[PDB]
Amino acid sequence: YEEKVRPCIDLIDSLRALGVEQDLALPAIAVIGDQSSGKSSVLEALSGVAVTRCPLVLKLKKLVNEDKWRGKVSYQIEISDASEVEKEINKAQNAIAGEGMGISHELITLEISSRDVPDLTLIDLPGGNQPADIGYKIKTLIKKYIQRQETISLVVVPSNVDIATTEALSMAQEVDPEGDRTIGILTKPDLVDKGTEDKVVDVVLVFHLKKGYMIVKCRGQQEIQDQLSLSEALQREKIFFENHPYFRDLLEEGKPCLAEKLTSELITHICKSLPLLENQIKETHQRITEELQKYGVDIPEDENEKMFFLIDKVNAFNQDITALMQGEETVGEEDIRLFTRLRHEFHKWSTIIENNFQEGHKILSRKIQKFENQAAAAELPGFVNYRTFETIVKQQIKALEEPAVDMLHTVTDMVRLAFTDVSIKNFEEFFNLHRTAKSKIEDIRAEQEREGEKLIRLHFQMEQIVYGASMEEIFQHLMAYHQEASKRISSHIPLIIQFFMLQTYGQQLQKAMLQLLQDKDTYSWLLKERSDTSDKRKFLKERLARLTQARRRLAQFPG
Template sequence: GIVTRCPLELKLKRVPATQAWKGKICYRKICTELQSASEVEKAIREAQDVVAGTRGAISGELISLEIRSPDVPDLTLIDLPGIARVAVGDQPKDIGEQIKTLLKGIIGCKETLNLVVVPCNVDIATTEALKMAQEVDPSGERTLGILTKPDLVDRGTEESIVNIIRNLVIPLKKGYMIVKCRGQQDIQNKLALATAIQQERKFFETHKHFSVLMEEGRATIPHLAEKLTNELVRHIIKNLPTLENQIREVLQRTLQDLQKYRRGTPRSESEKLIFLTDLIKLFNQDISQIMRGEEQLFGNEIRLFTKIRREFQTWGVNLLECAAKVKKNVPSKVWKYEDQYRGREFPGFTNYRTFEDIIKEQIIELEEPAIGILNNILGMVEEKFMELTKRHFANFHNLNRAAKMRIEDIREKQAAEAERHIRIQFKMERIVYCQDDIYINDLNSVKAENATKAGNGKGFQIASVSNQEPSFVQEMVSHTTAYFNGASKRLSNQIPLIILSSALHDFGDNLQTTMLHLLQEKDKLSHLLQEDGEAAKHRSYLSQRVNRLTKACQYLRDFTSL
């Protein structure tokens, strides 16, 4: 069955030989002191029963075991459950998948070194643990292979084990080690650790095939402990810059949060007014930064303006698709006129009404997508402003609510205003008009492009229009393409400008103004600045967090200066 059912953090700390063995196990809110090594197994089993239950299930909750002894190295390990394939007893039927999910969540972290423990009498190439390690660490930079039970190797296979240890079979950048642990009988007989290490050393020194591994420093638990310590130190040094940046970023964010909780609500009315003025001033400054596309970002946050640009790129794609649709639909429209509406005209006369109808029909199809882009961007802006209210006014629930109500009211007003402007723009677009010189330039550009294609041997072909179409059809395609090119350029800029003006800038300006109006409601100062009951607790939590992060930064600075 499964022995380790929860991640077990093992903190080993070497102490002087004059000090006695000490241990401590912690899980959830329970911490128990241990006086001897014989108490460890029972304590771990009891902890696992509390955390994961008594039916053999597993849990991702961490159990921490700290051991101080003269006989251990300074090292921290996390023991993980072994991979089970078949549920035993009352274990869940999907126990194997649960364990794999738990393992991947831990070994996938780039700050960890992964120790893959494999018995020597098992084919390492088919080992599930090594396969999982390779999935999360394809380069093998964070993986160290450890082979156990060398005394159970079948005769004649010793050299293949030596080749594995020498990294000749399945290469890992950190290589392999081989150890001989105490057997179950030795544990039951309470074989001392020092005696077990002596026996292990003797086994490797006298073994015909494995003694060379001992000489190379690839065998025994003491050599493994030394290698792990060195590898861990190198890995920590390598990841220090990233870790330091992450800690500084979290510290900066925590300090910013603490600024809002730094002091409670003042008592006098004049002080309350000054306090509220400062709160709104900082809030409005952040609104202005968002409007300029200069807001401060944390972690993987994306700037609001970047998100808005992506929406405008979608609008650009809509225009391109519409232009392609115009070219595709022109021949059928022209033939419909020829077959259904042509009167006294001779064949080949381009009908201006048909030209207008084609343009208007395609322009109308762009109106609703433009409104959709507007609504998407309004939602983004509203969400960002709501985040700011939470960041600045989280501990003043009445002020927070007042700000949110204003955001919702202004959003509705700006949505209606922006939609009105967009619909007016499309109403104007239904008037088919362009300056003569601009239109002639666009038409000449289309015809020059067609002539170039014809000269390259591609013939005259625009979208689905082939050179087999009559000349009057090709002429209509040229005219509609020329006009729509100009209209597309106009709309590709005009719609984003309308949206930026109403949905971002006017929204932000109006919000800042309405927030300043709160300062005139002096009879509501106490109501607006009524502090949340949890604010004091949160202030204490943030202060403690700042202290811990500051100490962490100091430790890293001291470490890197060594």
């Protein structure tokens, strides 16, 4: 029972000092008291070596070995020198402190070895106008710790004070209604009024305590440079409680000996707090872990290791590009494919052409009947510059040139965005990636549209120039031209379009992507991520590693 109880705290100690201290229902022994409290007087006699600017991981124990050594860490020596043990606080503290009377949230571990130092773990804390800085900075820190159900409370006040309004009680009242988790000690009895006198005390009361009290003494406070011995100042104070017919009879209940009492409570607290500890933590992991499952496969470091990843993303992108030109792409429910949307426009085109067909037909048919009736001349070569009549055909076609270009455009627009929304939905992260893509994506249109238009426009020139190549028969023969003309177009524009703007664009885009893959520097630059992803995970990473260590040594606990 003894053996285990002791390295029992041991684990908790190492938990926090290498911790992981954040996010704790975690319990330890926190000490509080005002500058007058005389709490330091306790710690002095507890260490033998005893300013404050942060919590002090006070770690002591008794292993029978040698003249005990002195050890401490400042940021994440065995000289047997009590004097130097205190001479580092004033330096270390001021490091965060800045040589001023300052305070920091941070901590500094302090572990001592001896065969007269009682085994225990405590964390002390620091001690008329406005506005106050440090004064508030102190009364705030004490509020942070004790606000937790498993933490403990330690108050220091003299024997003869307002026991009811001991500054400590007010603090205990602010956060503790249970009134069963607070221990208090009463100093410097010999400064009391030569006994109980007018004030009964016997505090060892105002409030009932689960664990109780104690009434040690500091002896004479005056010996500031006098330097009475640690082991002789405490063994001397022995005789004190061996006189007074009040503070003497209690040698059986209340007592130097805090060690026997104190360590006992710290150990018996741990076990109390471990039951849920495990449940909450090992459970905490499943909750944290799931978040990372969600994203965060991470960027590699080998120049070689690096590249594969980009050859992964360049490749995929293109896959999705191909699947648009292939027609065979992933489309949501109720939604249309790219290739599908096209054929509509393409059918429309043909429609529009058909419109011109009848349109042109009629007017032609009309323009003949009426201008025919003119006649009104002698039979002679005639008849109104028939090439003229032939030109009436072309007129209709030549009309379609502009519509054409139009259609090209509205497509290039569909493709443009298609490709674009493929980059978005692939490169939300790597905004440098996405950018570099945009250039290509938009960039290319330029070319493939520019060159694309040409052909259309040209084509139609061919249709004008290349002429063909019974008064009523002529209709038929001239109609056959238009009947014929139209067909080509209907089928050709779409081919010239669908070629340059779908197909060519793509093979060209893909290949533009691939070209990324030629330079070392580029990779690092491509691979950036918004801090929303990089910051957020990295923090999430850090927790999981510290958090998991916990699980391990908790489940590892031999007890």
